[PDB]
Amino acid sequence: QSEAEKARKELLELEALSMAVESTGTAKAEAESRAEAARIEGEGSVLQAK
Amino acid sequence: QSEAEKARKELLELEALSMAVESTGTAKAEAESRAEAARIEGEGSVLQAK
């Protein structure tokens, strides 16, 4: 069980990196899509106002 | 399981890129269609006013 925990530590490190990658990719994608839609709506609102 | 996580990290990176592409394409398309309809309505409103 000691040897198994010695390797399980490195397994948990790699799983931590993968969870980091997945979470930041999901949040970045959703936030940038909302910002792009908002920018297009803002320039459209400028043209509507004129 | 350690080797499988070493490759699964790169799989999750590529899936993050694909989700980014899909989300920003959908939001950009819907926002630009609404802006185009609004611009045509605005120029029509100018001509109606005259």
Swiss-Prot record, chains A, B:
Crosslinked residue numbers (Glycyl lysine isopeptide (Lys-Gly) (interchain with G-Cter in SUMO2)): K9
Coiled-coil intervals, chain numbering: none
Induction per the UniProt record: Up-regulated by IFNG/IFN-gamma.
Compartment(s): Cytoplasm; Nucleus, Nuclear pore complex; Cytoplasm, Perinuclear region
Cystines in this chain: none
Superkingdom in the source lineage: Eukaryota
Tissues with expression: Present in most normal tissues. Higher expression observed in epithelial cells with secretory and excretory functions, as well as in cells chronically exposed to xenobiotics, such as bronchial cells and cells lining the intestine. Overexpressed in many multidrug-resistant cancer cells.
Post-translational modification: Phosphorylated on Tyr residues after EGF stimulation.
Assembly mode: The vault ribonucleoprotein particle is a huge (400 A x 670 A) cage structure of 12.9 MDa. It consists of a dimer of half-vaults, with each half-vault comprising 39 identical major vault protein (MVP) chains, PARP4 and one or more vault RNAs (vRNAs). Interacts with TEP1. Interacts with PTEN and activated MAPK1. The phosphorylated protein interacts with the SH2 domains of PTPN11 and SRC. Interacts with APEX1. May interact with ZNF540.
UniProt note: domains: MVP 3 mediates interaction with PTEN.
Function of the protein: Required for normal vault structure. Vaults are multi-subunit structures that may act as scaffolds for proteins involved in signal transduction. Vaults may also play a role in nucleo-cytoplasmic transport. Down-regulates IFNG-mediated STAT1 signaling and subsequent activation of JAK. Down-regulates SRC activity and signaling through MAP kinases.
Protein name: Major vault protein
Part of the whole protein covered: 696 to 745 of 893
